[PDB]
Amino acid sequence: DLSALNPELVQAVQHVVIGPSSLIVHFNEVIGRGHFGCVYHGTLLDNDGKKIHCAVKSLNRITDIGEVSQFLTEGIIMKDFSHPNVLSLLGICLRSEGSPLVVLPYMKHGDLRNFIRNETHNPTVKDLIGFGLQVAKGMKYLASKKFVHRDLAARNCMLDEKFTVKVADFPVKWMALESLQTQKFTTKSDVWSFGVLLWELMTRGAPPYPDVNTFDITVYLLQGRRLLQPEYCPDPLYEVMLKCWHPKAEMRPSFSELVSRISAIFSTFIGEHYVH
Amino acid sequence: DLSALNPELVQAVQHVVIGPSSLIVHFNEVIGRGHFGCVYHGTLLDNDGKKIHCAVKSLNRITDIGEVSQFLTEGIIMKDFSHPNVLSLLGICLRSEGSPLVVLPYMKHGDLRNFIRNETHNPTVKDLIGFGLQVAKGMKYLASKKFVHRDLAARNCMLDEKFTVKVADPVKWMALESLQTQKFTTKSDVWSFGVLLWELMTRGAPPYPDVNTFDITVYLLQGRRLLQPEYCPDPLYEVMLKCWHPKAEMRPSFSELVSRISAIFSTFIGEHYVH
Numbered sequence: 001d002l003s004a005l006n007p008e009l010v011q012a013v014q015h016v017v018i019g020p021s022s023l024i025v026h027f028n029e030v031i032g033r034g035h036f037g038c039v040y041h042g043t044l045l046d047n048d049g050k051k052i053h054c055a056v057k058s059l060n061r062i063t064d065i066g067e068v069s070q071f072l073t074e075g076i077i078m079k080d081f082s083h084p085n086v087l088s089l090l091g092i093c094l095r096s097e098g099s100p101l102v103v104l105p106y107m108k109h110g111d112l113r114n115f116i117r118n119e120t121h122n123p124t125v126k127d128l129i130g131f132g133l134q135v136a137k138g139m140k141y142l143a144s145k146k147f148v149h150r151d152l153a154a155r156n157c158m159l160d161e162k163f164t165v166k167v168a169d170f171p172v173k174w175m176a177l178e179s180l181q182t183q184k185f186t187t188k189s190d191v192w193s194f195g196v197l198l199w200e201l202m203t204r205g206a207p208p209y210p211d212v213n214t215f216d217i218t219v220y221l222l223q224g225r226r227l228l229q230p231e232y233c234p235d236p237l238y239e240v241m242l243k244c245w246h247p248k249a250e251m252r253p254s255f256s257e258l259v260s261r262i263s264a265i266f267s268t269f270i271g272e273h274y275v276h
Numbered sequence: 277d278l279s280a281l282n283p284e285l286v287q288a289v290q291h292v293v294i295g296p297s298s299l300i301v302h303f304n305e306v307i308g309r310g311h312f313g314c315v316y317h318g319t320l321l322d323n324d325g326k327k328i329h330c331a332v333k334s335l336n337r338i339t340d341i342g343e344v345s346q347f348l349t350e351g352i353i354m355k356d357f358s359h360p361n362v363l364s365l366l367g368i369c370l371r372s373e374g375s376p377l378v379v380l381p382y383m384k385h386g387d388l389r390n391f392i393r394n395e396t397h398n399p400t401v402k403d404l405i406g407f408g409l410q411v412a413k414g415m416k417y418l419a420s421k422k423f424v425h426r427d428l429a430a431r432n433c434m435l436d437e438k439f440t441v442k443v444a445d446p447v448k449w450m451a452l453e454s455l456q457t458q459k460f461t462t463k464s465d466v467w468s469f470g471v472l473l474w475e476l477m478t479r480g481a482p483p484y485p486d487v488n489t490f491d492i493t494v495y496l497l498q499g500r501r502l503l504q505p506e507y508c509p510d511p512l513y514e515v516m517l518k519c520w521h522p523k524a525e526m527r528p529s530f531s532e533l534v535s536r537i538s539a540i541f542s543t544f545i546g547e548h549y550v551h
């Protein structure tokens with residue numbers, strides 16, 4: 001269905017909606033085939049007149065008004081976000097035929113997890129601390145706007161041509177302890193997941209807790225067990241991680257703290273293959 | 277936490293928000309305990325300043341910008357609804373020093389399930405079918421608005437002073453395709469409605485008492501449905517069975533259910549609760 005939604009909500013959404021006659025979607029050029037879904041090359045004609053290469057995702061799941069309306073306000077929220085470490089939303093596209101589209105700036109190097117995993121790239125310790133730093137900044141911003149990411153992981157972080165990490169939103173082994181029992185998600189719950197993301201970065205994309213089942217994780221963490229220090233991770237950076245994995249959310253560091261702390265560490269390091 | 281939300285959204289929500297200077301909540305006067313959590317007696321002054329007796333629920337979970345924003349958009353949807361068989365929303369209240377409040381018209385006889393389980397009440401077969409017909413009418417309207425309910429059940433239906441049923445807002449009610457795809461449609465609602473009809477005719481007996489919550493999926497796959505209630509007419513049990521057709525599109529629409537149940541209901545005499 002097109003737009004049989006509440007007039008005031010539709011009015012609120014217009015600045016996020018892209019006119020389809022200003023978008024081309026190349027459904028024959030697929031960007032990635034993974035947990036991302038179906039992502040295609042797009043070309044967006046912006047109001048000033050700049051033709052922009054972009055990524056377009058089709059949202060195959062939406063149907064009822066409730067879903068679309070949920071989706072639209074989610075669009076409004078992300079549109080208001082402005083930060084070099086947070087992925088921008090260019091807009092959403094509502095169509096009479098087919099499910100809605102999400103339009104995003106093109107990220108040359110794809111998601112951070114794939115980038116660090118493949119042998120062709122040789123990021124140093126500093127590069128990986130750097131990437132982790134940028135995520136912390138991204139999350140430091142999001143936290144300020146009192147937004148809870150809820151799904152932080154290296155796969156959900158993007159990397160542009162200038163090697164700027166862009167946190168995107170798009171998982172029991174990434175969740176805080178209390179998220180697994182009380183279903184509570186907070187800014188501090190995101191801090192836990194950031195910890196796991198750091199582990200991912202310093203392992204160059206190893207799967208976390210490889211020898212435990214998804215259901216056994218809860219008791220595992222309650223045995224006081226934690227992720228083991230990655231081969232690239234320096235002693236002071238591993239201490240940071242462990243703080244992010246404290247069972248009492250309040251004990252865990254804020255994202256503002258992690259930024260200045262990780263930044264301190266980052267500066268002790270030299271030798272970089274991917275800058276900025 | 278103040279409106280640190282999007283200004284354009286706040287503009288759209290304005291017609292649903294209640295100024296707290298026009299609301300008194302009696303936090304000592306609890307209306308219902310359990311399932312609906314903590315509901316309180318309230319008094320609202322409408323646009324024109326009339327006192328309206330209401331029920332007020334506190335939303336203890338809603339905290340971050342995303343949650344509040346969703347809550348607001350859902351309020352915008354509910355507020356637009358206008359049908360005698362759907363619980364209307366009087367408004368929402370965003371407190372600076374407390375979690376948000378939902379404000380609803382006071383329903384004398386509480387939820388439909390609690391009302392029928394009570395042995396003090398004596399609803400006839402015609403009475404139970406009549407209630408089923410009203411849910412159907414509400415769900416018909418909801419369907420016409422392309423709105424999927426997702427949690428249709430007797431416990432989610434309210435009953436006012438004039439004995440009007442008001443549809444308001446879980447695996448044993450879930451459709452076969454819902455339990456394996458996480459997919460909800462109005463056809464999925466039709467299923468839950470069938471289970472609701474079963475609830476009415478059994479006067480609020482718990483469905484599938486012997487099969488465990490996890491075992492339900494294989495049970496319906498095997499082919500077993502709920503047995504015919506002791507005091508359920510045959511043409512109505514037939515209806516339920518149609519509502520439980522494994523092929524989603526083969527199930528009837530709420531519009532047809534209104535027509536059919538209306539006929540079945542019209543063939544009966546004897547009501548202790550007249551709508």
Ligand SMILES: COc1cc2nccc(Oc3ccc(-c4cnc(Cc5ccccc5)n(C)c4=O)cc3F)c2cc1OC
Binds near residue numbers: 033055056078
């Ligand atoms: C060359 O390699 C790649 C380049 C890419 N370049 C840009 C974007 C890419 O992927 C995406 C990253 C994030 C999203 C995405 C973001 N935000 C939301 C929330 C949301 C909700 C409601 C309204 C609006 C937004 N969703 C639901 C999303 O799906 C979609 C994407 F396609 C790329 C992927 C690539 O390889 C896999």
Ligand SMILES: COc1cc2nccc(Oc3ccc(-c4cnc(Cc5ccccc5)n(C)c4=O)cc3F)c2cc1OC
Binds near residue numbers: 309363380445
């Ligand atoms: C005399 O006895 C009773 C009288 C009652 N009289 C009116 C309402 C009652 O219960 C409720 C019925 C429904 C709701 C309710 C409705 N719709 C939504 C969606 C929603 C989402 C987002 C924004 C706005 C709305 N929610 C989240 C709700 O909680 C809350 C209630 F408290 C009563 C309960 C009674 O005893 C059990």
